[PDB]
Amino acid sequence: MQILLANPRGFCAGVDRAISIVENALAIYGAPIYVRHEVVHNRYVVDSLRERGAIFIEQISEVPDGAILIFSAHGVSQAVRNEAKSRDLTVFDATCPLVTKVHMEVARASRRGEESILIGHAGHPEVEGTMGQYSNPEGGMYLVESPDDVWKLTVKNEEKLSFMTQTTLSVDDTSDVIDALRKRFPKIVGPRKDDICYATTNRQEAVRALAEQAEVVLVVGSKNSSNSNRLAELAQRMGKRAFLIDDAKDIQEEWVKEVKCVGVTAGASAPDILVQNVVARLQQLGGGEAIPLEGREENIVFEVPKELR
Numbered sequence: 001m002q003i004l005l006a007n008p009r010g011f012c013a014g015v016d017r018a019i020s021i022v023e024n025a026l027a028i029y030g031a032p033i034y035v036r037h038e039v040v041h042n043r044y045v046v047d048s049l050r051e052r053g054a055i056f057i058e059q060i061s062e063v064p065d066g067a068i069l070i071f072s073a074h075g076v077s078q079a080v081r082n083e084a085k086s087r088d089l090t091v092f093d094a095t096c097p098l099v100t101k102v103h104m105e106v107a108r109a110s111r112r113g114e115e116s117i118l119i120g121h122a123g124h125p126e127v128e129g130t131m132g133q134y135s136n137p138e139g140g141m142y143l144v145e146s147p148d149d150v151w152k153l154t155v156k157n158e159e160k161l162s163f164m165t166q167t168t169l170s171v172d173d174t175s176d177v178i179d180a181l182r183k184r185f186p187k188i189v190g191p192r193k194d195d196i197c198y199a200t201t202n203r204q205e206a207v208r209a210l211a212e213q214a215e216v217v218l219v220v221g222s223k224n225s226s227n228s229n230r231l232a233e234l235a236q237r238m239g240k241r242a243f244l245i246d247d248a249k250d251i252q253e254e255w256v257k258e259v260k261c262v263g264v265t266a267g268a269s270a271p272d273i274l275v276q277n278v279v280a281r282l283q284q285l286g287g288g289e290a291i292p293l294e295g296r297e298e299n300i301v302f303e304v305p306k307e308l309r
């Protein structure tokens with residue numbers, strides 16, 4: 001059994017920054033450090049930090065006075081930011097620069113009272129945060145997930161309409177949604193393509209190449225990781241068996257019995273150590289040396305704020 005590794009895979013720049021924000025806050029101020037929501041959607045990263053004295057919470061009320069609070073990489077609504085602003089807290093923001101970029105455009109629309117449409121998945125925290133940048137009752141903020149959602153949407157003024165997307169969507173599905181918005185709302189304005197980040201685009205391209213060599217694809221990532229789900233999905237749609245797994249223990253041997261070529265990738269929130277353990281397990285089940293495929297280069301790093309160095 002040949003083991004192949006997708007490239008790129010694993011940690012993106014936003015994840016690496018957000019984890020280091022929490023680590024360094026814990027290093028400078030000691031435990032406990034409060035973090036609103038899982039800093040990233042990876043159980044292993046969260047349990048690590050948790051056991052290091054970071055405390056994950058879901059509302060600002062849970063955080064006491066004089067505390068340190070980190071916003072997760074997914075970002076937060078204005079309402080959440082304001083509730084923190086005026087609550088005697090030291091706040092550090094681990095929101096990924098590539099989410100903040102989308103936030104600034106929703107805010108722009110809201111100020112001009114012009115309607116905005118977000119392409120994304122209902123109830124995800126990025127979506128909550130991004131919708132929660134729009135506040136103007138004169139305009140509106142709408143969520144669509146599919147072409148059908150678009151075909152059903154009515155707006156107040158379609159002459160003054162913009163769109164934005166979640167950063168971790170399927171490139172192909174999103175493209176279909178955008179073609180729909182453009183056919184329904186010919187004046188709609190948006191980015192040249194979408195707001196899907198480089199990491200999501202790159203990992204999707206990478207898992208495509210992987211899937212055309214491997215019969216089975218394992219994706220290391222947690223169940224609530226949107227980007228990780230897209231990777232498994234993409235492989236499955238190519239007709240390969242694909243499984244989303246937190247770690248090596250989740251591998252059931254039937255999945256790879258009599259499989260000649262197995263592929264492994266990782267979502268953007270999944271540490272390389274997890275991939276290493278998965279590969280060790282596959283080798284126990286009869287795989288050889290892991291061969292990394294050729295991949296598109298990634299070179300972006302996002303530094304922590306000066307005051308967290």
Ligand SMILES: O=P(O)(O)OP(=O)(O)OCc1ccccn1
Binds near residue numbers: 041267269
């Ligand atoms: O894929 P999702 O579920 O959004 O989250 P993660 O698995 O934490 O991936 C990193 C991330 C954070 C924030 C924004 C984009 N990407």
Ligand code: F3S
Binds near residue numbers: 197198268
């Ligand atoms: S939005 Fe940022 S957190 Fe990672 S998956 Fe994309 S670089």
